[PDB]
């Protein structure tokens, strides 16, 4: 509830739309287990769509780390330093392409 949670005002980062639009996403960092059942949808994102995503946004540098993980993650880093680590554990391919385009 709003008294239990903080608040803020509506703001862009550096007046994001005035002169030019700067994409605020800086990095994306996937960690996908190769032999691992939870990353089975995220393995197909790295297969199918991580090349296609990396040409719609050239200002975002993408990392696919591919280690022994139990819960695959995407760590979305922004230009102002905020870090959103969302978990793509046992998601489909469709639920990740909406997850990553939302970040």
């Amino acid at each position: 509830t709003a008294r239990g949670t903080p608040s803020r005002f509506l703001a862009s980062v550096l007046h994001n739309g005035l002169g030019r639009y700067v994409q605020q996403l800086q990095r994306l960092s996937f960690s996908v287990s190769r032999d691992g059942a939870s990353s089975r949808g995220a393995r197909e994102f790295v297969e199918r769509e991580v090349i296609d995503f990396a040409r719609r946004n050239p200002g975002v540098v993408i990392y696919v780390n591919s280690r022994p993980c139990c819960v695959p993650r995407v760590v979305a880093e922004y230009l102002n330093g905020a870090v959103r680590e969302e978990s793509i554990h046992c998601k489909s391919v469709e639920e990740i392409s909406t997850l990553v385009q939302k970040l």
């Binding site: 550096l14 005035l18 002169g19 800086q26 050239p58 540098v61 990392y63 760590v75 102002n80």
Partner: protein, 275 residues
Amino acid sequence: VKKGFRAAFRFQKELERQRLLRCPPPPVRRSEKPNWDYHAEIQAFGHRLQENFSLDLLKTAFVNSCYIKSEEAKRQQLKSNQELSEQGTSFSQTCLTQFLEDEYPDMPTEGIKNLVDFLTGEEVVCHVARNLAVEQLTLSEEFPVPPAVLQQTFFAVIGALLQSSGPERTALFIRDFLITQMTGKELFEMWKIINPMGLLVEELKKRNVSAPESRLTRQSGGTTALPLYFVGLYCDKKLIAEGPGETVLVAEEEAARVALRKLYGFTENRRPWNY
């Protein structure tokens, strides 16, 4: 002893979070943390700003002088920033003054010099460079990057951009990132003046207009601790300004600023910047 792994694994990771809310680590830069690739992140840098840099020229616009004097002192157990932050500072000190003079052709030489002293001073330009991810692409000696070095580095990026696309791209890149920083600001929040009534007399004598008469248009609660006055500034029975204030000398000093903002074309309802 209840058996099982998963609650003890959750609780171990939720005590590490409490170890960081009691003992947080000192800041390290993004370079010496995982997931980093410097020739990647410099390419991806320019694509964000929609600018075509030349990567030999942009890479050396991050190599500061202090970074170099640590590498050679560590080599007992590269070209600098300086050439490119001289062409990028002299240009944005001169490409900024051309925009502020075309938009406000009535501001004096003393004010526009102080407007460009604010847009190219350390406190706006190190808010621009920190949110454009310059602070993560610098090579420097210490961390967090001090604003002597970061104000220097950001203009070497403007220096690199000038030799990669010329002024007819760089006059945009200053208009979109430094000129936008004055939006929603008052004039004397940048150009801070002492005694605006002195500065208002001489501007009025310059335009061959007679003296302003301080005069009390409206007031309220003159014998309380919360008064309001409005002091109107009449130049031969026409008012050029009026301003409010807690006492009379506050309202006369502020109506002197209200006159200067109307004289210079820096009012609140003035025409916005065309982008």
